[PDB]
Design a binder for this molecule. Structure first.
Ligand SMILES: CSC[C@H]1O[C@@H](n2cnc3c(N)ncnc32)[C@H](O)[C@@H]1O
Ligand SMILES: CSC[C@H]1O[C@@H](n2cnc3c(N)ncnc32)[C@H](O)[C@@H]1O
Ligand SMILES: [Cl-]
Ligand SMILES: [Cl-]
Ligand SMILES: [Cl-]
Ligand SMILES: [Cl-]
Ligand SMILES: [Cl-]
Ligand SMILES: [Cl-]
Ligand SMILES: [Cl-]
Ligand SMILES: [Cl-]
Ligand SMILES: [Cl-]
Ligand SMILES: [Cl-]
Ligand SMILES: [Cl-]
Ligand SMILES: [Cl-]
Ligand SMILES: [Cl-]
Ligand SMILES: [Cl-]
Ligand SMILES: [Mg+2]
Ligand SMILES: [Mg+2]
Lengths: 385, 385
């Protein structure tokens, strides 16, 4: 059997770019909870002992930006200089242009709202996992989630918030369909405290993190482990290392699989086609596979600023479709509503008070079962033949 | 003939994210010109009347960060509040952690330098253009370059620095090979002054920008034009609209084609595998096509922090290879040196004083003929059959 190697990575919630994604989305959730019609373009950056929130917000909400920044950093575990940021003592620069909505006298609907911007977005799904995501991505991501879980529940209390994971999967190509064979290489680089030796780190990473996440059927005697390969990782997060919102867009999506149109997600209100557009084409691709029309699917949509209808749509099944891609294109366009005002309503994205977007801003926007992830709910599609 | 629609976009040099890419790379070029061994991780952000440079630099160079920021903004055309930023009067926050190199007493080589970080990078090429790039991307990009050129040379002196472009191409799939048929839709949204009417804008965009860029063979009576579809665009750049380094990674690469591993380019010294890794796999994919082994090619490499040899390589020819992909993989691994210390030397990326990286930070890193773009030079490869 001829195989190939495909790699995906992940970063932990304490990675300084991901910290900025989560702060940007916590700000957005706090605006939506009071004012579902908030317009939010909230950018975060960070460096040693500093966070700055900036960009533009129109809302009726009353939001304590500084407090959201501090609460988000503290819940991640950034509780002191030693761990890489003191939530309680660090400089927080509040640099948002805040506006209340327009006040007007006399003088449209969701169907006719133009896109807020131009751009293009891709959706992907594959039958290789139950969540219809690529294995390389799913295992990298779940190793990062697991690190956060065993730190916080005290099973590995030596851990610190920052770190990175990476998984190389050996695949077979069955006529366009991706058949994962085995895990070829596992890389973990995790922040940690000064108590723990290199040998305790390696042992706890194998037993408490790798073994519970990666199915035994994919691991064998030839799988390569790199555990903290560059030595000690005591200093982390923003300390000596700048973060920005929107710098982990491939970890937020498909790990190198499918495609990306370039738009970041976090800190954007869900009327923005970069977010609502990407979410609906995930639901489309996922619904193409789950209904049995194909084993894999890629969908692109594109927009013009001020135009409601998409400029272009396309479907690619990598020759796995059981009916022609032109027909799947027709069924996608018939079943899904790509108009920006309608996508936000149909995926119920403005509904407040469940920390929905803060949930998406670590460990991926796709492949999760959480009921706030409305784009992960398969639409039944009619097809035949 | 069955066809499909594929969209790519571009943003102009005055777009506030792209402004941050260029400031980050101008800082890097100024460090390299004096000290080729500079370590540079220089992040830029911008909002109304402000730029901030931040991140981390170790160098022997003497660099005037504020002056680089002002000179870069001024050369773009940001000369007043009205145009969207005053290069001469705006706030510039210099927030870099600057270090001189380590001073040490007594006690390696390029072959053994470990990667500076983990990650994965993709290279793509296609025979559909002379520059072996996707047409959608090449036409979007060249419409943006043209806007900048007719502003600055005074042919359309009503233009302002900001703007966006987008091109939908109608393609045929010849057995894996992309055959562009026609341009389906052209979108231009350009900043402008208060003199010019909507009709003069539309007329000058068709005659001075579209007609010179897009070959007549691809344009017909059914091609859709969207010219400033959302009305007037007088305010632009950072004014009312935040920019960050590394937010246009798909415009920097392949416009949705091929794949992306997630790493931004700008503000990073070329020892960083995100940059040197991506550049060499562009040269690999481009060399696979140009030598005639395939019509299209995708190459992935991946790294572990502190490990010199890549964790994984793969080649995909989309079934256009004239010899098996496993054999092309073998010829790529034999001909190219993926070790981080060797890639920087082989592509001569530390050589200073030609504004090399500032050139890459607008209108794409790939498909340009400029001799500083060493990754665009095809390597002769031995193959046969
Ligand atoms: C190379 S430093 C940049 C990134 O790599 C990771 N990193 C930082 N320090 C270390 C280390 N000592 N070992 C491994 N990875 C690290 C962190 O998540 C950081 O965001
Ligand atoms: C939607 S505003 C965000 C981006 O869209 C573009 N833009 C800003 N104002 C306008 C406008 N009036 N018409 C079209 N595009 C715009 C700019 O390049 C900006 O970076
Ligand atoms: Cl403060
Ligand atoms: Cl308003
Ligand atoms: Cl939008
Ligand atoms: Cl400790
Ligand atoms: Cl450390
Ligand atoms: Cl829908
Ligand atoms: Cl979940
Ligand atoms: Cl100043
Ligand atoms: Cl040093
Ligand atoms: Cl690196
Ligand atoms: Cl004017
Ligand atoms: Cl305007
Ligand atoms: Cl080489
Ligand atoms: Cl050029
Ligand atoms: Mg980063
Ligand atoms: Mg932006």
């Amino acid at each position: 059997m001829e195989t190939f190697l495909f790699t995906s990575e992940s970063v932990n919630e304490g990675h300084p770019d991901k910290l900025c994604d989560q702060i940007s989305d916590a700000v957005l959730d706090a605006c939506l909870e009071q004012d579902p019609d908030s317009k939010v373009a909230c950018e975060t950056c960070t460096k040693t002992n500093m966070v700055m929130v900036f960009g533009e917000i129109t809302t009726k909400a009353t939001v304590d930006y500084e407090k959201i920044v501090r609460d988000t950093c503290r819940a991640i575990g950034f509780v002191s200089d030693d761990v890489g940021l003191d939530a309680d003592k660090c400089k927080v620069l509040v640099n948002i242009e805040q506006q209340s909505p327009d006040i007007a006298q006399g003088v449209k609907c969701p169907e006719e709202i133009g896109a807020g911007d131009q751009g293009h977005m891709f959706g992907y799904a594959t039958d290789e996992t139950p969540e219809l995501m690529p294995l390389s991505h799913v295992l990298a991501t779940k190793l990062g989630a697991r690190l956060t879980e065993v730190r916080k529940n005290g099973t590995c209390a030596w851990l610190r918030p920052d770190g990175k994971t990476q998984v190389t999967v050996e695949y077979y190509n069955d006529k366009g369909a991706m058949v994962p064979i085995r895990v070829h290489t596992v890389l973990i680089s995790t922040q940690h405290d000064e108590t723990v030796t290199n040998d305790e780190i390696a042992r706890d990473l194998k037993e408490h993190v790798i073994k519970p996440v990666i199915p035994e059927k994919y691991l064998d005697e030839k799988t390569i482990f790199h555990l903290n390969p560059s030595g000690r990782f005591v200093i982390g997060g923003p300390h000596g290392d700048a973060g920005l919102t929107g710098r982990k867009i491939i970890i937020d999506t498909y790990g190198g699989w499918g495609a990306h149109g370039g738009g970041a997600f976090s800190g954007k209100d869900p009327t923005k086609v970069d977010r609502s557009g990407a979410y609906i084409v995930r639901q489309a691709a996922k619904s193409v596979v789950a209904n049995g029309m194909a084993r894999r699917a890629l969908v692109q949509v594109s927009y013009a600023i001020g135009v409601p209808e998409p400029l272009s749509v396309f479907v690619d099944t990598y020759e796995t479709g059981l009916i022609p891609d032109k027909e799947i294109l027709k069924i996608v366009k018939e079943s899904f509503d790509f108009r920006p005002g309608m996508m936000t309503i149909n995926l119920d994205l403005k509904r407040g008070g469940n920390g929905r977007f803060l949930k998406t801003a670590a460990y991926g926007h796709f492949g999760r079962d959480d009921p706030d992830f409305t784009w992960e709910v398969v639409k039944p599609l009619k097809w035949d033949k």
